[PDB]
Amino acid sequence: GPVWRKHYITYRINNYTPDMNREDVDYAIRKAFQVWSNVTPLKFSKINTGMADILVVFARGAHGDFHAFDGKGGILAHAFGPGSGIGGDAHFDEDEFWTTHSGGTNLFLTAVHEIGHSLGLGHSSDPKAVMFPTYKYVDINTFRLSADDIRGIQSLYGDPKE
Numbered sequence: 001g002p003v004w005r006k007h008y009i010t011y012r013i014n015n016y017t018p019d020m021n022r023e024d025v026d027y028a029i030r031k032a033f034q035v036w037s038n039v040t041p042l043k044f045s046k047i048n049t050g051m052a053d054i055l056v057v058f059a060r061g062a063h064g065d066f067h068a069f070d071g072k073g074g075i076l077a078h079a080f081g082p083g084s085g086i087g088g089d090a091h092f093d094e095d096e097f098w099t100t101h102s103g104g105t106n107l108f109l110t111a112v113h114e115i116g117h118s119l120g121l122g123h124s125s126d127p128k129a130v131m132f133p134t135y136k137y138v139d140i141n142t143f144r145l146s147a148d149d150i151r152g153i154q155s156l157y158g159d160p161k162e
């Protein structure tokens with residue numbers, strides 16, 4: 001399938017959810033990218049001007065991409081695989097209640113799953129995998145990618161360099 005054709009990839013946060021402060025949204029997103037860069041040769045950097053490779057957007061309902069959101073619950077976010085235009089972009093349903101821990105939908109865990117899609121990964125049947133299709137909370141301090149997630153992403157990008 002299509003894959004990013006460079007190792008240095010930029011992201012930009014288009015707009016912000018009012019559910020968490022700016023520092024907390026930035027940290028969740030940064031840490032989510034870090035989960036994937038830790039096990040591949042990919043490098044991610046945040047930019048604030050210019051066209052980014054990956055745009056992170058919060059939106060609700062119909063928002064211009066033929067994939068309208070559905071209110072609180074159900075689909076929590078979605079993302080586009082590598083390709084032209086919006087390819088790579090990650091959209092989070094603003095009707096969810098985003099949190100730093102577990103009092104609602106954890107942004108970090110959700111961002112890990114969606115960035116997986118943005119990098120080219122599909123769903124897993126392994127219930128311990130972050131790419132499993134269904135959200136579940138796990139202690140952020142105890143969180144680790146499953147072996148399944150690791151094999152999947154390394155099959156697309158290889159493992160870290162010496």
Ligand SMILES: CC(=O)c1ccc(-c2ccc(CC[C@H](O)CC(=O)O)cc2)cc1
Binds near residue numbers: 079130132
């Ligand atoms: C086990 C673990 O750490 C874990 C992390 C994240 C998830 C996760 C799965 C799905 C979703 C949301 C799926 C979204 O509504 C639509 C999609 O992208 O498929 C968010 C988080 C599941 C397990």
Ligand SMILES: [Ca+2]
Binds near residue numbers: 077
């Ligand atoms: Ca929803």
Ligand SMILES: [Zn+2]
Binds near residue numbers: 063065067078
């Ligand atoms: Zn969208």
Ligand SMILES: [Zn+2]
Binds near residue numbers: 123133
């Ligand atoms: Zn998914």
